[PDB]
Amino acid sequence: NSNICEVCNKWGRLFCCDTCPRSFHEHCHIPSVEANKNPWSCIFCRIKTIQERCPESQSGHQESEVLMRQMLPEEQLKCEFLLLKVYCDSKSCFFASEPYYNREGSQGPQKPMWLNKVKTSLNEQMYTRVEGFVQDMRLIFHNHKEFYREDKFTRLGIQVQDIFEKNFRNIFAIQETS
Ligand SMILES: [Zn+2]
Ligand SMILES: [Zn+2]
Ligand SMILES: [Zn+2]
């Protein structure tokens, strides 16, 4: 197995996947690494198994159909993985914890949002459809762009939104377009 966490790239107390060489800190994995379960298979493996069991799941999909899907076990796992892929980027630090807003010339967002809040929401099964999760995710980046206006720091939101959207298209097999 790898000797660094797949998500944050640090060593530490790592749990090793039994079916692939990746390793994780307890709370870097999503869901948080399970207490028992021998063998244990990580989310990368669990997602690959879904694909292998239903190869047609990789045919193209319309976003609008994906969003209205109910959060059954497989869609729950897919959103957990997508969330994880965002945390995998070091720029996710800016969006992880609860933000605050005190900048001359700007007003904070009406509905603040952050990665850890989405993580908790998933963990507590608060989303009934994929739409709920995707909306909160895009809201993080939208809030950021609006608040930071012409400061160059707005670019961090563009950058992390691009990682989210690329991973969304891949995980949910959204039909490729020009
Ligand atoms: Zn980690
Ligand atoms: Zn694995
Ligand atoms: Zn099938």
The C-alpha atoms of residue 110 and residue 175 are separated, in whole angstroms, by 33
Instruction: Give φ, ψ of 151 to 5 degrees.
Output: -60, 145
Experimental method: X-ray
Report the distance separating Cα 141 and Cα 161, nearest Å: 6
Q: By the 8 A CB rule, do 160 and 86 touch?
A: yes
Question: CATH number of the domain that 86 lies in?
Answer: 1.20.920.10
Is the same domain home to 10 and 74? no
Do 32 and 65 share a structural domain? Answer: no
Q: Cα(142)–Cα(84) distance, rounded to whole angstroms? A: 20
141-173 CB burial, b ≥16 within 10 A, e <16: bbbbeebbeeeeebebbeebbebbeebbbebbb
Ligand 3 midpoint to CA 156 (Å): 39
Q: Provide the CATH number for the domain around residue 38.
A: 3.30.40.10
**17 alpha carbon – ligand 1 mean position (Å):** 14
Single-letter amino acid code for the residue at 162: D
Q: Which ligand is nearest to the CA of 45?
A: 2
Residue 5 Cα to ligand 1 midpoint, Å, equals 4
Nearest bound ligand to CA 51?
Answer: 3
Ligand 2 centroid–CA 111 distance in Å is 36
Number of other residues whose CB lies within 10 A of the CB of residue 175: 10
Range of the domain at 12: 1-59
Q: Give residue 133 CA to ligand 2 midpoint distance, Å.
A: 24
Residues with CB under 5 A from ligand 3 (ion): 54
Alpha carbon of residue 167 to chain centroid:
8
Tell me the ligand closest to 24's alpha carbon: 1
Dihedral (Cα; 158, 164, 169, 171), 10-degree rounding: 170
Maximum Cα–Cα distance for the chain, whole Å? 55
Q: How many domains does the chain have?
A: 2
Please enumerate in sequence order all residues whose Cβ is within 8 A of that of 3, keeping only pairs 6 or more positions apart, or say none: 11, 14, 23
Query: Who contacts 91 (Cβ-Cβ below 8 Å, separation ≥6)?
Result: 156, 159, 160, 163
In sequence order, the 6+-apart residues with CB closer than 8 A to the CB of 74 are 50
**Beta carbons of 12 and 26 less than 8 angstroms apart:** no
Distance of alpha carbon 58 from alpha carbon 130, whole angstroms: 17
17's CB contacts (< 8 A; 6+ apart) are 1, 23, 24, 40, 41, 42, 44, 45
**Nearest partner of 23 among 3, 8, 40, 43, judged by Cα:** 3
d(CA 2, CA 23) in angstroms, rounded, equals: 6
